[PDB]
Design a binder for this molecule. Structure first.
Ligand SMILES: O=C(NNS(=O)(=O)c1ccccc1)c1cc(-c2ccccc2)ccc1F
Ligand SMILES: [Zn+2]
Length: 272
């Protein structure tokens, strides 16, 4: 009665939440999505016919990043409305708190793919408001279940701050975050801050760290608090750590998986 299972690419994936596909589409056992254009279909046979006809082999919009077989496309919601709406309905299957599916023109979407000989296969995305009055540098972020916890979420979060840096601005994801979202951001912030604390020594203030990472002072402070690296003095949070403690944190299992990194040389983008 609601959509509870999709087929996309070679994956069958169970829904986590209600998404408002038209009612007729929920009635079916599965919903079938073209992995390239994201068209959603009611039957295995309309899906297979679509597969033979559809000419898309990657997302629309501009490939603003490409390194080996990892690519990001920037897709403006005003120029590719139907694709973006299809993407938001797909995302809402895995996001409890997303509430915007149809009004996509105020958003830009950054679609992460992993490419082979067949084409560019969707892994996840984040959306971002063109004009965020609240300084949010991500609106929603979603990694499809079979790619979660495999470094792709980490890549997109780094990606979003690489945009913020090029805009000379600080940014923070729109709240509330999903459970995995919060763990992923906290662990991303800690990694980046620790590595900067190692690489200087160094009279880095919290403001310094904010300017260098585009992470907000508040997100820096709450992260340094959970690491016990901040003291408080007459109303001001102040960095308090030894080189040894920094390396103890960095040697931990948390930071041991080799990351897929964002190579700023491969990013093609200037603020609009
Ligand atoms: O897959 C994710 N994190 N695991 S990760 O291996 O990329 C990682 C992220 C940050 C630091 C280390 C590893 C992830 C997943 C989501 C997500 C959130 C809600 C629904 C579906 C996916 C959002 C951000 C994420 F980073
Ligand atoms: Zn298609």
């Amino acid at each position: 009665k609601y959509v509870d299972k999709i087929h996309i690419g070679n994956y069958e994936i169970d829904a986590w939440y209600f998404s408002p596909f038209p009612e007729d589409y929920g009635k079916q056992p599965k919903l079938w999505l073209c992995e390239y254009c994201l068209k959603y279909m009611k039957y295995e046979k309309s899906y297979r016919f679509h597969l033979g006809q559809c000419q898309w082999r990657q997302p629309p919009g501009k490939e603003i990043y490409r390194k080996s077989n990892i690519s990001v496309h920037e897709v403006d919601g005003k120029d590719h409305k139907i694709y973006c709406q299809n993407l938001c309905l797909l995302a809402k299957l895995f996001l409890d708190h997303k509430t915007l599916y149809f009004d996509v023109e105020p958003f830009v979407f950054y679609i992460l793919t992993e490419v082979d000989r067949q084409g560019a296969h969707i892994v996840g995305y984040f959306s971002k408001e063109k004009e965020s009055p609240d300084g949010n540098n991500v609106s929603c972020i979603m990694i499809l279940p079979p790619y979660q916890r495999r470094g792709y979420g980490r890549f997109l979060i780094a990606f979003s701050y690489e945009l913020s840096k090029l805009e000379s601005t600080v940014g923070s994801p729109e709240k509330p975050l999903s459970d995995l979202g919060k763990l992923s951001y906290r662990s991303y912030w800690s990694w980046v801050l620790l590595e900067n604390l190692r690489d200087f020594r160094g009279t880095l203030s919290i403001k310094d760290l904010s300017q260098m990472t585009s992470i907000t002072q508040n997100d820096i402070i709450s992260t340094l608090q959970s690491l016990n690296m901040v003291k408080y003095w007459k109303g001001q949070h102040v960095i308090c750590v030894t080189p040894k403690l920094v390396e103890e944190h960095l040697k931990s299992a948390q930071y041991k998986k080799p990351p897929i990194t964002v190579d700023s040389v491969c990013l093609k983008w200037a603020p609009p």
